[PDB]
């Protein structure tokens, strides 16, 4: 539904705002809770209807690419202002009812199918 | 994940941003789905723990107080750099892990308690 489970973190309510007017990056933002005693890592994204997705996860540095690093029994917000995963060059205009799918990898857990929820105005 | 649902709405994933302490002001925010064919809209929020709500729903200009207006079969972001609710004058420190328990007025569909998760 709106979260996802994969080992022992829990993907919740995954979502990205659209690119805005005459722009084609959006970025995508989620709350991932590690429910585990070890940690892990969000390493990379794959998404099919943009070109490439970017891990901007050092909060005090965004303009790095970074993974998302995700401590033992704690939990971690990717949202605007903070860390979160750039999507470039949408191949298409967003629309809002539409849904994206997205594959999380994480570095210990491993893979997860995601459908991002589509924030637009 | 808390999902809430009243009428015909749907409250996911209430969450706010703590106090940069030694601030005692908080910012609450959550996604809203209206998947009914009636508007609605958040007009007050009360929270226990603190000593007002301010709505600030109008993502056009975010000085102004205002409801957040929940238009049928639509959904509302409350984000970081957009609508939100100020949370003004905590009474103590937040305790992180345990939530803050708050009830949402909407103006048909009443009241709903719930439980939001803190950012720290
Ligand atoms: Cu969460
Ligand atoms: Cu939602």
Redesign the pocket.
């Given at each position: 539904m709106?979260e996802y489970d994969v080992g022992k973190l829990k993907v919740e309510?995954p979502?990205l705002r659209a690119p805005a007017d005459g722009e084609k990056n959006a970025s995508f933002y989620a709350f991932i809770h590690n429910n585990g005693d070890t940690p892990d890592k969000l390493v990379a994204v794959k998404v099919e209807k943009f070109g490439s997705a970017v891990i901007h996860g050092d909060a005090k540095n965004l303009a790095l690419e970074a993974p998302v690093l995700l401590p033992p029994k704690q939990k971690i917000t990717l949202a605007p202002g903070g860390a979160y995963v750039a999507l470039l060059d949408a191949k298409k205009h967003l629309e809002v009812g539409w849904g994206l799918e997205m594959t999380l990898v994480f570095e210990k857990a491993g893979e997860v199918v995601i459908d991002a929820?589509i924030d637009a105005p």
């Amino acid at each position: 539904m709106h979260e996802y489970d994969v080992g022992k973190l829990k993907v919740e309510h995954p979502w990205l705002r659209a690119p805005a007017d005459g722009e084609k990056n959006a970025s995508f933002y989620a709350f991932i809770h590690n429910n585990g005693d070890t940690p892990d890592k969000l390493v990379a994204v794959k998404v099919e209807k943009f070109g490439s997705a970017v891990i901007h996860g050092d909060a005090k540095n965004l303009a790095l690419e970074a993974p998302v690093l995700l401590p033992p029994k704690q939990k971690i917000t990717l949202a605007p202002g903070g860390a979160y995963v750039a999507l470039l060059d949408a191949k298409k205009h967003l629309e809002v009812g539409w849904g994206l799918e997205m594959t999380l990898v994480f570095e210990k857990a491993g893979e997860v199918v995601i459908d991002a929820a589509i924030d637009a105005p």
